[PDB]
Amino acid sequence: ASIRDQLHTIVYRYPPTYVLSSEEQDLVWKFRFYLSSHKKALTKFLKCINWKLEDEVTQALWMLANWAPMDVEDALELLSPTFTHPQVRKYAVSRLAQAPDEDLLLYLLQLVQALKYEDPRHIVHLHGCIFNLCTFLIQRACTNATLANYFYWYLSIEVEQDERAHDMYAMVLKMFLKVLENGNFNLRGIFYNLRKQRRFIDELVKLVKLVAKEPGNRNKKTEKFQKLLAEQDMFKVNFTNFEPIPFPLDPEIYITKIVPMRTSLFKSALMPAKLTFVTSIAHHEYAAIFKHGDDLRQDQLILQMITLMDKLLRRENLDLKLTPYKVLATSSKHGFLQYVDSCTVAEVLAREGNIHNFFRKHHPCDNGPYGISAEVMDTYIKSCAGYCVITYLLGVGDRHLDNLLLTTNGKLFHIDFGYILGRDPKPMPPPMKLSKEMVEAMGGISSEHHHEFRKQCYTAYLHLRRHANVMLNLFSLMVDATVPDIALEPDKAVKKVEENLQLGLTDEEAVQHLQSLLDVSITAVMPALVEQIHRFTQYWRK
Amino acid sequence: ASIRDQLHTIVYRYPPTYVLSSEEQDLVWKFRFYLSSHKKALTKFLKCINWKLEDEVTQALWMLANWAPMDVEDALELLSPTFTHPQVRKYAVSRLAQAPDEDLLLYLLQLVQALKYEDPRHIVHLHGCIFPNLCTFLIQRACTNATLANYFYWYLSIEVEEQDERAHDMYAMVLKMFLKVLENGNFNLRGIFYNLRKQRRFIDELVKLVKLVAKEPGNRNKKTEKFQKLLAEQDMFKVNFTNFEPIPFPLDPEIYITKIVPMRTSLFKSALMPAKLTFVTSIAHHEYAAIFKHGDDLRQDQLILQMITLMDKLLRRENLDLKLTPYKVLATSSKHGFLQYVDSCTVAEVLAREGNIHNFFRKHHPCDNGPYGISAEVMDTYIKSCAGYCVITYLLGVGDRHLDNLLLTTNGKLFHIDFGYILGRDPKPMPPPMKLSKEMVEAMGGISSEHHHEFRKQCYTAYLHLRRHANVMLNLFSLMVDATVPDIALEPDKAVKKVEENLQLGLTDEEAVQHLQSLLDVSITAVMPALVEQIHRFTQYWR
Ligand SMILES: C[n+]1cnc(N)c2nc[nH]c21
Ligand SMILES: C[n+]1cnc(N)c2nc[nH]c21
């Protein structure tokens, strides 16, 4: 029938997550033989025939083999725990094989997690062989230098009933380094580079340990810091100059040396340092942060997430001017974070009671809406929208004016991500996090900009909804991940992101929903709208 | 061209009211000769022509004669004051003539208002013919049907009683003519005249009695005991109240009276105290009751009721039945009136007599299973009565709503009453733009109910439907510019713009629902105590 097609159109588009109708699950089977139509169908297909054990399986592998080629995201689902079978893993891996390197890089983080899934036998035999997914990751790590660095750092962290999963990761990392040694010139070139990175990290850790060990005023500890860096050959490789190393946090950039005098130390109780590095070429300086206190895996997942969303949005050709900095954690309790010149909002307010005066110093225009360049305002509005919607989907907690930073450009971003998926020290939300100052920085509900802001939020939300599947699959693979917040309710953890997505709603409904949350959050923050609500309560009483 | 049609379809649906048309009328004209596509087009076509060239008028006139015939609702615009010219007005009347009596009756109230616009010399000449076109039309029809005669008579009578000076004389002449046509006419015309005479005499005695009751010192009970005695006292008055010669009730000509039961008569709580009455019906003793108010001008409440009745009619046509109750008012001459009495209990009474609304439905209609041990239909009718009213009071700007002021019925329905404050006039400083007591929201089961969600959904569909049918509502309001309805009279012009603004015709539907959703959200948050606290916590989070 022609109508059944609309109901099929329904199933291929709607879920990445359906359990629904393990009775209808075979109606698809009946029309699929002809409607091996397009890519998406196949993932849905595999979910049901597999439940029954045996003769259908052999028929299904043929069916799959002949099926229109799968998109990559299906493959991420195929690598998940749900399907145990090897051929489908093989198929999923051939899809990744088709994927370009940059794509692996984003996905890559989960793929390392994906290794936890079978088969150990595939791992044991490769290991036994020198003394399928794992094999593929290694080969492609060896093809690309940047890829190899990230692969290495992720494995080093996993090795640093989960004891058996550790064991496996250890075997996989060690093989990887061994193939590089046995390597032809370029592999070995990468290998030596990895060894060089590590040595350096270990030296910077040792310096930090010794900086922490002296009790002090913050200034005293910066003074001490500058002296240790300046001081030569007490530390295996001098810090004021060393052989050029490609930054571990960013492979593309090489570093010759740090600069001591430039380094300043952060207000946070456990104190990360800003360091200045020099690029191998043209004496560019790179500024990074080196944090000593906590495991950064959580911050980095969020950052990968943001990156993904921005990418899709830009592929949408909405640039919300998201400013997603790279984060890498070396070990649990050391990491590097990109640094972008920025002022924390609270700082701005101490420096200036208003954000607009703050912009006014940097990009003033006379016919400009407010004494700001029109384009700055637009960029500010967009960055807020993007970030409200992203935090929302991600259910980020603990926002405060120290947490959100502003650039002279107007981009707005969030710095610190200790609380994910709604976890929060405080007892209530708001679900949408906006300072009063930021809404006044928009010029309030009356203003035209604020309306543009709201408008952007909805449309961003609508788009992300469309690419539901990628985010859910990536998360599907963070269950066993060791992010503190996932670990508490891991099973539940995937559902929370999907709840925020509200995929159940038709679009108009979805926009309405987000409008709702916007209204609550804005009214709460503004003092004038709170007073108006009180007059309305007042009205029914008498 | 191909798109031009679309700009024009946009012009045709969107407003009936707009002065918007400026260049558009000139481009539209070129197309008028080629396509009188639609009935709607005719109203749009009419707008451009008359002021300028007189010959231009001849061309437009020929155009209209063969033009796709106008819908009755649009015709009303024509009787409206903005269009002076005699030939178009004749056309409006011809369109009304085709209309069936019931639709004709619903509008009847406005026509009397419209009567003001037709030139008096047209009316003076008709008077001239009898004593030693629309006005003729109203009388001709008023005569053909008794119920129409009755309504026409009461509306005119209210108007006749002492700028106003010229309009009073006009109405008086029309009435005198209508009465002379009936006495003169045949049997039915005479029959109508006789029944009208009975109605008139009956009310007057009814009024004498109410006046005696009011003088008497005492609280309500002392006064009701007194009222009970007078009806029962035969022969104090011209009419004997315990029995009479049957009279068509002014509220329903369809039903005669014949009796009143003194014992059944009560009075209400409200400030000037209306009696209930009962009568027998002319047939098999079935009672009727109505109310009867001694203390103000009902005109405003009747317009509002006409408005609610019509809106309900439109929604039923769509097939939304929100179980509205559009009870009947007529005024008599201002300061008496009647109102149909529907059995109901005011919410405040319901809360005191039974702790909460849920308990109240539960006692009358209890089914252990669903949803609240309250039979489902009742819940559904309560949800629907609720949606229909917030939307309708909101469009109409009904204000001064209180618990004393809404009612329930055993059946579930909710409705309003006593529309003294209209069009955003309020005795208080604020809205809320939507009127929901907490008591009512709890009745729904609060924010997450299938039922509360159901109510919001019902409101949205209702809003959109009314949005589509805006043309009729605006035309009727335009017709009561000169209304002598207090709230409208404060600024006559603003009244029409205010109902229109509430309408949100500019917005796209997706936006319109967002706009309505917004108004509902502030209104419910302020009403519920938990939500206010949630907001306080959110304020607390930041600073
Ligand atoms: C400027 N900046 C950028 N990224 C961070 N993670 C950060 N923390 C403090 N300041 C910061
Ligand atoms: C109780 N009651 C019922 N129906 C009415 N129309 C009315 N008006 C005031 N009170 C009322």
Side-chain angles (χ1 to χ4, degrees), chain A residues 1-117 119-542, chain B:
Chain A
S2 306
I3 280 171
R4 295 178 186 180
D5 200 341
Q6 289 173 17
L7 321 174
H8 269 348
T9 202
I10 239 178
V11 201
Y12 72 74
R13 259 218 319 188
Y14 297 155
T17 38
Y18 262 147
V19 150
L20 301 210
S21 58
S22 67
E23 298 146 306
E24 134 191 4
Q25 78 168 41
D26 32 300
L27 94 77
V28 208
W29 185 21
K30 98 103 80 170
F31 244 85
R32 271 192 173 257
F33 292 106
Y34 295 124
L35 275 308
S36 57
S37 65
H38 217 81
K39 316 158 89 62
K40 329 320 209 92
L42 183 55
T43 123
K44 296 311 183 178
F45 169 134
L46 286 344
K47 290 193 169 178
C48 38
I49 97 277
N50 253 34
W51 194 80
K52 213 49 220 269
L53 301 167
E54 283 185 354
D55 213 328
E56 327 215 332
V57 160
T58 117
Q59 174 186 345
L61 310 340
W62 202 99
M63 260 312 305
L64 160 145
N66 206 34
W67 205 292
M70 288 300 252
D71 225 282
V72 168
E73 298 38 281
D74 97 67
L76 299 156
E77 165 128 50
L78 298 197
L79 295 174
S80 50
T82 93
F83 349 73
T84 12
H85 167 110
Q87 225 82 317
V88 282
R89 306 285 210 155
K90 163 183 189 184
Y91 178 112
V93 188
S94 37
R95 302 319 312 173
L96 287 168
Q98 292 288 331
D101 295 27
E102 85 185 30
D103 269 17
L104 290 101
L105 262 173
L106 315 84
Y107 295 21
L108 159 290
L109 174 35
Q110 283 72 20
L111 286 54
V112 166
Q113 294 295 130
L115 295 169
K116 293 179 180 196
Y117 305 43
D119 189 340
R121 292 175 175 262
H122 303 98
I123 301 141
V124 323
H125 270 283
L126 201 66
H127 190 129
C129 224
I130 333 288
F131 316 86
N132 189 333
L133 168 63
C134 41
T135 68
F136 154 100
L137 271 166
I138 304 150
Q139 168 182 341
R140 285 218 71 165
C142 310
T143 289
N144 167 317
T146 110
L147 247 160
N149 133 203
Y150 283 107
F151 192 49
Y152 167 81
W153 280 123
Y154 293 12
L155 313 203
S156 91
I157 241 180
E158 292 311 86
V159 313
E160 83 172 42
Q161 184 57 14
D162 292 321
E163 302 169 354
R164 292 176 188 170
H166 138 126
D167 271 351
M168 167 290 188
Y169 273 14
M171 339 299 199
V172 146
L173 184 157
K174 273 93 186 290
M175 307 192 65
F176 172 62
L177 309 206
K178 199 62 193 180
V179 40
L180 298 184
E181 294 170 31
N182 286 343
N184 98 71
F185 265 0
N186 289 313
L187 298 216
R188 332 123 65 32
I190 279 321
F191 171 115
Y192 194 144
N193 256 337
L194 278 178
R195 271 212 327 107
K196 273 208 138 51
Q197 279 180 337
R198 174 163 290 285
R199 280 231 302 149
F200 177 93
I201 292 319
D202 299 11
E203 278 329 86
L204 227 190
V205 188
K206 291 187 189 175
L207 149 34
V208 176
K209 283 202 174 200
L210 297 175
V211 140
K213 276 183 186 70
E214 190 228 79
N217 176 311
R218 179 160 71 86
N219 271 41
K220 301 183 207 307
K221 266 170 162 160
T222 63
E223 303 153 25
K224 166 71 76 185
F225 215 90
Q226 307 148 312
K227 280 333 310 300
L228 276 275
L229 301 178
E231 221 67 56
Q232 292 251 45
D233 27 278
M234 87 143 284
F235 271 131
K236 351 269 265 203
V237 220
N238 112 38
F239 281 101
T240 169
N241 181 348
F242 39 99
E243 302 194 328
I245 279 175
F247 210 152
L249 157 155
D250 171 336
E252 284 221 299
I253 297 195
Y254 295 121
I255 56 177
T256 141
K257 31 174 178 150
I258 304 173
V259 173
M261 287 283 199
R262 273 208 153 276
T263 81
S264 36
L265 238 160
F266 277 150
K267 43 193 273 200
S268 171
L270 70 316
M271 51 215 314
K274 174 187 168 187
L275 292 61
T276 294
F277 290 74
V278 267
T279 66
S280 77
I281 205 158
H283 181 69
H284 259 234
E285 58 199 78
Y286 193 82
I289 301 150
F290 186 75
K291 223 186 190 203
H292 44 51
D294 71 79
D295 149 303
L296 285 118
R297 263 168 290 182
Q298 171 159 304
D299 295 51
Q300 80 177 21
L301 203 203
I302 287 311
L303 260 60
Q304 145 174 223
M305 280 314 320
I306 296 173
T307 331
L308 213 179
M309 311 197 175
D310 166 25
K311 290 216 155 205
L312 310 195
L313 283 174
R314 292 204 323 270
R315 285 222 276 88
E316 305 294 4
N317 200 28
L318 299 202
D319 194 357
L320 309 188
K321 323 223 89 66
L322 299 218
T323 86
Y325 51 86
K326 260 307 153 215
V327 157
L328 170 62
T330 51
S331 145
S332 87
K333 80 190 265 208
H334 27 300
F336 282 87
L337 322 196
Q338 174 153 193
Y339 169 131
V340 344
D341 183 46
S342 55
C343 253
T344 194
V345 192
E347 279 192 46
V348 166
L349 298 177
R351 219 88 269 247
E352 279 94 334
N354 44 25
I355 275 171
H356 302 231
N357 269 347
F358 157 118
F359 284 164
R360 190 184 60 79
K361 83 175 283 167
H362 297 309
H363 304 233
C365 196
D366 288 1
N367 277 297
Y370 315 146
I372 306 93
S373 274
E375 16 90 18
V376 169
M377 272 306 267
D378 200 40
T379 140
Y380 166 72
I381 254 55
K382 294 188 178 175
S383 36
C384 306
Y387 276 105
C388 295
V389 176
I390 274 153
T391 76
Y392 172 78
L393 291 178
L394 296 179
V396 166
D398 192 26
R399 320 327 303 173
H400 57 293
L401 305 129
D402 294 298
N403 257 12
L404 333 192
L405 306 335
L406 218 44
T407 83
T408 69
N409 268 3
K411 296 193 197 198
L412 175 39
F413 53 101
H414 298 100
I415 164 195
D416 172 25
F417 305 53
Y419 290 105
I420 298 181
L421 317 183
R423 291 313 197 284
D424 192 305
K426 308 191 181 203
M428 284 266 197
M432 226 83 168
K433 332 304 175 98
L434 303 179
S435 96
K436 189 202 131 235
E437 305 81 344
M438 284 148 53
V439 220
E440 289 209 331
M442 293 195 214
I445 133 87
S446 348
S447 101
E448 191 171 70
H449 278 328
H450 176 100
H451 178 225
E452 255 293 81
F453 155 76
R454 290 183 93 106
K455 197 172 184 76
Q456 222 77 42
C457 300
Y458 305 103
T459 149
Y461 186 64
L462 286 188
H463 287 309
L464 280 280
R465 277 171 38 89
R466 284 174 218 268
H467 320 293
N469 314 228
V470 206
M471 276 149 188
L472 296 189
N473 291 309
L474 285 256
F475 279 93
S476 298
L477 307 199
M478 294 321 262
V479 171
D480 318 306
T482 306
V483 159
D485 290 31
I486 272 157
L488 280 77
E489 294 198 292
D491 31 6
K492 269 204 183 171
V494 176
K495 249 219 166 176
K496 294 153 203 165
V497 184
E498 188 196 316
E499 295 287 331
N500 302 4
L501 285 177
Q502 225 82 23
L503 302 175
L505 312 195
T506 99
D507 318 49
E508 298 83 348
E509 327 191 317
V511 189
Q512 280 172 22
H513 161 108
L514 194 73
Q515 175 185 66
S516 152
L517 309 204
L518 280 189
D519 277 339
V520 191
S521 294
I522 296 165
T523 45
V525 100
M526 305 301 270
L529 293 172
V530 108
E531 297 218 61
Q532 191 200 234
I533 257 201
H534 280 266
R535 283 196 204 265
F536 283 23
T537 22
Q538 222 73 10
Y539 167 95
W540 269 91
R541 181 221 79 87
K542 202 170 95 80
Chain B
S2 36
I3 201 159
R4 292 179 199 162
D5 69 333
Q6 192 182 350
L7 325 175
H8 291 256
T9 159
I10 278 252
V11 175
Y12 111 162
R13 245 262 203 87
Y14 291 76
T17 161
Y18 281 36
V19 191
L20 190 168
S21 50
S22 167
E23 312 309 58
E24 314 75 340
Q25 65 279 51
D26 250 1
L27 52 138
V28 165
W29 172 351
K30 79 169 63 195
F31 289 135
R32 301 166 173 194
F33 174 72
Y34 264 40
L35 72 174
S36 69
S37 153
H38 257 333
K39 331 170 200 175
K40 314 273 195 178
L42 183 52
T43 109
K44 302 304 166 75
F45 170 140
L46 258 317
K47 294 270 204 159
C48 337
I49 300 319
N50 300 282
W51 137 68
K52 200 192 156 79
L53 249 160
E54 296 155 53
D55 150 296
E56 202 183 334
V57 173
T58 70
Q59 261 212 60
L61 265 272
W62 177 60
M63 276 274 211
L64 139 153
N66 354 254
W67 196 296
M70 215 167 186
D71 267 309
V72 190
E73 9 298 339
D74 290 288
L76 301 159
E77 183 178 10
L78 303 208
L79 305 152
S80 98
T82 37
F83 303 30
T84 88
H85 164 124
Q87 213 79 67
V88 314
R89 296 216 162 201
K90 192 153 290 152
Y91 177 74
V93 191
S94 71
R95 291 316 310 167
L96 285 195
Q98 191 206 60
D101 314 29
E102 57 193 59
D103 267 9
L104 182 31
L105 178 176
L106 208 161
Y107 308 129
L108 161 56
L109 159 43
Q110 284 72 26
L111 306 202
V112 184
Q113 284 311 126
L115 235 211
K116 292 181 188 191
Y117 303 127
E118 281 213 323
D119 317 355
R121 204 60 213 197
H122 310 86
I123 292 150
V124 195
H125 213 271
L126 204 207
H127 153 318
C129 144
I130 281 161
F131 267 31
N133 168 316
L134 162 147
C135 163
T136 5
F137 158 68
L138 276 183
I139 295 171
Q140 194 106 105
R141 273 282 220 135
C143 297
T144 353
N145 160 317
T147 129
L148 269 172
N150 143 127
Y151 270 107
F152 183 60
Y153 168 119
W154 277 110
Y155 287 110
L156 280 170
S157 203
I158 319 156
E159 281 306 330
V160 159
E161 88 181 28
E162 23 36 64
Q163 171 43 24
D164 302 313
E165 305 181 36
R166 297 309 136 112
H168 157 151
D169 274 72
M170 168 279 263
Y171 272 128
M173 219 166 293
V174 196
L175 203 184
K176 273 62 256 285
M177 270 178 264
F178 178 48
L179 295 184
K180 196 45 188 172
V181 182
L182 284 170
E183 278 195 62
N184 269 7
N186 56 35
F187 261 136
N188 310 349
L189 285 295
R190 255 207 291 310
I192 293 174
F193 173 92
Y194 281 140
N195 281 311
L196 279 169
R197 214 263 272 185
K198 291 173 175 174
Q199 280 184 12
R200 158 56 80 202
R201 275 172 46 213
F202 176 101
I203 295 291
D204 298 322
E205 299 308 289
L206 202 264
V207 195
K208 286 180 192 172
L209 146 18
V210 157
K211 271 201 147 195
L212 288 197
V213 148
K215 261 194 197 165
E216 166 84 3
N219 61 35
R220 114 181 28 71
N221 274 296
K222 216 78 207 287
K223 296 212 182 192
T224 133
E225 292 202 79
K226 156 66 77 167
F227 196 104
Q228 283 184 30
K229 209 343 274 296
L230 293 151
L231 306 158
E233 187 95 65
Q234 326 228 12
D235 193 27
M236 259 203 64
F237 313 93
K238 260 92 165 180
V239 52
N240 184 138
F241 288 126
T242 67
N243 198 296
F244 31 103
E245 295 289 53
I247 308 152
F249 199 42
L251 272 182
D252 276 53
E254 261 230 322
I255 309 148
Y256 304 103
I257 22 199
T258 307
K259 266 182 203 165
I260 291 175
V261 206
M263 286 340 191
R264 277 239 42 63
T265 91
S266 28
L267 316 213
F268 297 97
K269 326 79 53 186
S270 31
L272 176 280
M273 303 139 54
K276 191 165 173 214
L277 283 268
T278 302
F279 320 67
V280 313
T281 50
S282 107
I283 87 283
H285 300 263
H286 312 343
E287 284 142 296
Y288 185 80
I291 310 166
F292 184 80
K293 210 151 199 179
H294 344 310
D296 64 350
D297 202 358
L298 279 177
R299 301 184 216 186
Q300 172 153 283
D301 292 71
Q302 73 182 343
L303 171 174
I304 273 303
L305 257 94
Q306 171 218 214
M307 279 295 301
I308 296 182
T309 314
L310 197 219
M311 286 202 194
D312 168 300
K313 260 198 188 287
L314 298 181
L315 298 214
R316 287 207 320 271
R317 274 229 258 111
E318 300 318 53
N319 191 250
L320 277 272
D321 194 344
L322 325 202
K323 334 264 47 188
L324 308 200
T325 35
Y327 59 85
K328 287 189 189 91
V329 159
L330 158 58
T332 288
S333 86
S334 71
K335 87 208 298 181
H336 4 314
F338 282 79
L339 334 199
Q340 186 179 21
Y341 168 92
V342 309
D343 216 58
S344 41
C345 222
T346 147
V347 155
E349 296 187 352
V350 166
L351 292 188
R353 194 101 319 183
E354 245 93 23
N356 58 49
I357 295 182
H358 263 70
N359 272 325
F360 162 32
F361 285 148
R362 210 185 279 125
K363 166 175 156 176
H364 289 288
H365 283 275
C367 143
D368 254 295
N369 294 9
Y372 289 67
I374 303 168
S375 209
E377 313 88 35
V378 189
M379 267 305 289
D380 174 74
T381 110
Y382 161 68
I383 249 83
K384 297 211 199 136
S385 325
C386 256
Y389 274 94
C390 320
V391 172
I392 290 190
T393 63
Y394 157 69
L395 289 150
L396 281 170
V398 195
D400 162 78
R401 261 42 227 159
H402 40 247
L403 294 314
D404 308 290
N405 219 54
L406 303 242
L407 334 188
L408 263 321
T409 126
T410 90
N411 252 24
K413 290 171 156 210
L414 169 104
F415 56 113
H416 303 223
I417 269 178
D418 183 11
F419 309 96
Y421 289 100
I422 233 48
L423 301 179
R425 304 316 320 319
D426 217 64
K428 273 218 189 67
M430 287 308 167
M434 239 85 185
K435 308 308 157 88
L436 291 146
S437 86
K438 159 192 177 172
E439 295 75 6
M440 290 174 79
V441 175
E442 306 211 331
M444 251 156 198
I447 297 49
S448 61
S449 309
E450 317 51 50
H451 281 282
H452 160 103
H453 170 258
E454 226 306 322
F455 152 73
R456 291 190 104 109
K457 147 174 130 55
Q458 214 68 65
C459 283
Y460 304 132
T461 90
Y463 188 43
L464 304 178
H465 274 279
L466 283 177
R467 260 161 85 62
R468 314 194 214 281
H469 284 279
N471 305 316
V472 209
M473 283 164 199
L474 287 171
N475 274 344
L476 292 155
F477 264 67
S478 271
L479 263 173
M480 336 276 311
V481 156
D482 306 318
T484 130
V485 161
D487 307 302
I488 276 168
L490 234 77
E491 218 315 279
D493 290 329
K494 282 177 186 172
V496 189
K497 179 158 189 175
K498 279 188 267 182
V499 182
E500 203 185 75
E501 223 284 315
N502 280 331
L503 256 166
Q504 248 32 16
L505 303 153
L507 304 208
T508 181
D509 311 16
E510 300 83 46
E511 288 158 14
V513 175
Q514 271 143 39
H515 159 85
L516 184 63
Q517 178 199 98
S518 172
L519 288 183
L520 282 194
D521 262 352
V522 294
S523 284
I524 297 182
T525 26
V527 150
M528 303 310 302
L531 291 183
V532 204
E533 288 164 19
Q534 200 182 243
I535 281 211
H536 276 299
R537 300 214 84 173
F538 291 160
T539 279
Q540 189 85 48
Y541 193 85
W542 284 103
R543 182 145 62 158

